[PDB]
C-alpha cells in the first residue's frame, strides 16, 4: 500500500485520495463519499524489476458513510488483514 | 600494512606425466616404500621422508605428490620419485610438471565476531556453526577459498603460488579488522 500521492499544484492529495492517512489507509471518524478509495493497494505483475499495477478498494454507494473503526491483524500465513466498519 | 604475520604454506600439490607404461604389481614388489591394494584401489602409493611427502604412481604414466611446504620442495620430491621409478627399470621421464594446489594459514591475534562478517558478507561468506565451527568465505581475486575462525586464525586454499595467498591475505585483512 502506497501513501496518497500529493498534487504538485495545491500541495495536497488529489481528490480521490482525500481521506487516506499518511500510511495509505482511511482515518476513523472521517466522512467517505462515493468513488473515493479506502485502501490504496497495488500488487506486482508477476502473475527486471516486477512492475506493480494498482487495484484500489473503492467505496461505492448512493450515500456518504462515516468510518467508525479500522483494525489490522496478521494470520499465521503472514497475510495482512484489514477490516473497516462504516456507519450511516 | 601487515600485522607482522606472513601466511605460512602447509601443503603443496604437484603432478607430472611419466611418459611410459608401468606395472603397479612390479613397483609394489620392487620398492620398499610402495603400497599397493587393488582390491580397494588400483594405484601404488609412495612415501619419502625428505621432502616429507606422499605420492601416487599409476600404470598410465602419471604421478601425484603432496605434503611439501614449498613448490620447489614438491618438485624435488617428485623428481626423487621419478629417479626411484627410473632405477626400478621403468623408462619414465619428467614431462609436463604442474602445480595444482597449495594450502596456507595465518592469524590476526584478535577475536572474530563472525556474525557481523556473515551479516555484511552473506553473499560470499557462507557461515554455518552447527555442523562446522569455522566460517567459509570464497573470494574471486584470485579464485581462493578461505576458512575463518573466532580465535583469529585463517586457512587459505585453492592457490597456485604464494603470491596469491599473500594477496588474498592482504585483501581480507582490512575486512578482518573491520
Amino acid at each position: 500500500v502506497m501513501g496518497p500521492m500529493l498534487d504538485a499544484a495545491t500541495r495536497k492529495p488529489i481528490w480521490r485520495h482525500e481521506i487516506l492517512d499518511a500510511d495509505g489507509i482511511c482515518s476513523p471518524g472521517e466522512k467517505v463519499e462515493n468513488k473515493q478509495v479506502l485502501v490504496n493497494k497495488s500488487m506486482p505483475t508477476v502473475t527486471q524489476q516486477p512492475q506493480y499495477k494498482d487495484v484500489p478498494i473503492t467505496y461505492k454507494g448512493a450515500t456518504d458513510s462515516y468510518i467508525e473503526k479500522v483494525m489490522i491483524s496478521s494470520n499465521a500465513e503472514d497475510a495482512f488483514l484489514i477490516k473497516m466498519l462504516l456507519r450511516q | 600494512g601487515p600485522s607482522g604475520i606472513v601466511p605460512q604454506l602447509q601443503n603443496i600439490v604437484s603432478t607430472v606425466n611419466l611418459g611410459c607404461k608401468l606395472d603397479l604389481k612390479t613397483i609394489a614388489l620392487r620398492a620398499r616404500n610402495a603400497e599397493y591394494n587393488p582390491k580397494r584401489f588400483a594405484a601404488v602409493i609412495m612415501r619419502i621422508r625428505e621432502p616429507r611427502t606422499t605420492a601416487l604412481i599409476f600404470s598410465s604414466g602419471k604421478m601425484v605428490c603432496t605434503g611439501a611446504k614449498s613448490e620447489e620442495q614438491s618438485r624435488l620430491a617428485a623428481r626423487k620419485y621419478a629417479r626411484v621409478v627410473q632405477k626400478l627399470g621403468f623408462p619414465a621421464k619428467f614431462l609436463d610438471f604442474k602445480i595444482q594446489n597449495m594450502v596456507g594459514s595465518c592469524d590476526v591475534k584478535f577475536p572474530i565476531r563472525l556474525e557481523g562478517l556473515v551479516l555484511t558478507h552473506q553473499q560470499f561468506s557462507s557461515y554455518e556453526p552447527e555442523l562446522f565451527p569455522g566460517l567459509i568465505y570464497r573470494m574471486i581475486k584470485p579464485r581462493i577459498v578461505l576458512l575463518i575462525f573466532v580465535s583469529g586464525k585463517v586457512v587459505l586454499t585453492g592457490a597456485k603460488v604464494r603470491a596469491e595467498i599473500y594477496e588474498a591475505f592482504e585483501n581480507i585483512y582490512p575486512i578482518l579488522k573491520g
Binding site: 492517512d21 499518511a22 482515518s27 476513523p28 471518524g29 483494525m71 491483524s73 | -
Partner: protein
C-alpha cells in the same frame, strides 16, 4: 513521524512502520486499531 496504533487490551501505543508481524510489544496480542483522525469534521444538529 511513524503511525501509532492501539493494541487490543492494554491500549498502549504501538508502532510498526515496517513489514513486521502485527504483535503488541507488551502482551502477545495481535490485533491493532488506527488512532482517531487528526482533522476536524462538521456535523448538522438535526
Amino acid at each position: 513521524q511513524p503511525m501509532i496504533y492501539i493494541c487490543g487490551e492494554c491500549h498502549t501505543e504501538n508502532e510498526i512502520k515496517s513489514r513486521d508481524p502485527i504483535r503488541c510489544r507488551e502482551c502477545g496480542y495481535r490485533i491493532m486499531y488506527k488512532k482517531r483522525t487528526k482533522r476536524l469534521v462538521v456535523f448538522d444538529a438535526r
